[PDB]
Amino acid sequence: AELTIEDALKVVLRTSLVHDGLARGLRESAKALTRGEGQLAVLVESVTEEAISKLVQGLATENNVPLIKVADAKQLGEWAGLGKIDRDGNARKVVGASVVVVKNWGADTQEREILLEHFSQQ
RNA sequence: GGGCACCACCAGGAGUGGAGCCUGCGGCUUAAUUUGACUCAACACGGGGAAACUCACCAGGUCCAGACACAAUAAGGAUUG
Ligand SMILES: [Mg+2]
Ligand SMILES: [Mg+2]
Ligand SMILES: [Mg+2]
Numbered sequence: 240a241e242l243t244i245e246d247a248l249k250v251v252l253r254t255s256l257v258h259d260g261l262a263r264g265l266r267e268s269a270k271a272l273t274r275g276e277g278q279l280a281v282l283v284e285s286v287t288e289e290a291i292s293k294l295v296q297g298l299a300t301e302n303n304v305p306l307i308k309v310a311d312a313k314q315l316g317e318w319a320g321l322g323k324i325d326r327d328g329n330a331r332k333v334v335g336a337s338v339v340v341v342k343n344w345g346a347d348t349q350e351r352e353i354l355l356e357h358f359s360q361q
Numbered sequence: 362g363g364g365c366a367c368c369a370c371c372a373g374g375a376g377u378g379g380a381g382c383c384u385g386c387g388g389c390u391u392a393a394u395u396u397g398a399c400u401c402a403a404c405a406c407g408g409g410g411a412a413a414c415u416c417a418c419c420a421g422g423u424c425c426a427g428a429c430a431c432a433a434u435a436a437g438g439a440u441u442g
């Protein structure tokens with residue numbers, strides 16, 4: 240299986256982390272959405288009380304929609320790298336990443352862009 | 362017994378010790394009147410003539426500048442403002 244299984248969002252996130260352009264957490268994400276900063280939106284599916292998700296949706300709506308599904312949040316966090324050192328390989332203490340919004344991007348083109356386009360044009 | 366030296370004395374000078382005042386050091390005083398050093402070899406010495414700084418003392422307040430290791434919160438905020 241050569242085709243990516245929604246692995247042109249995770250990569251983007253990683254890139255952002257590397258270059259320091261991630262609005263992780265909710266307030267930060269909201270802020271990003273509000274001004275010329277928040278370009279891609281990343282909201283958790285499994286949200287208790289549905290409230291955070293709703294908020295995120297609202298934010299997305301407000302001017303320009305940059306949203307996507309997200310696979311449980313924890314996975315995303317893991318991919319990003321939430322934990323120092325963590326032995327030789329893997330073995331990171333699990334953390335729920337919560338709401339994330341992308342600033343900067345950094346890396347250009349590749350499959351992420353395509354995915355974004357697909358999400359957009361309907 | 363024999364040497365040597367105006368930090369010994371002679372022969373002399375200038376003196377200090379008195380006077381007032383500076384400044385050191387005691388003693389007392391004081392929250393605290395920071396401390397070191399008392400024969401020459403402590404006492405205008407600490408290059409020490411302190412207005413704060415210096416600064417060590419006292420009365421009061423501020424600050425972490427608690428490197429690093431390992432867990433409790435680990436974003437429904439750690440703590441920073
Ligand atoms: Mg002598
Ligand atoms: Mg004096
Ligand atoms: Mg003298």
Ligand SMILES: [Mg+2]
Pocket residue numbers: none
């Ligand atoms: Mg003076």
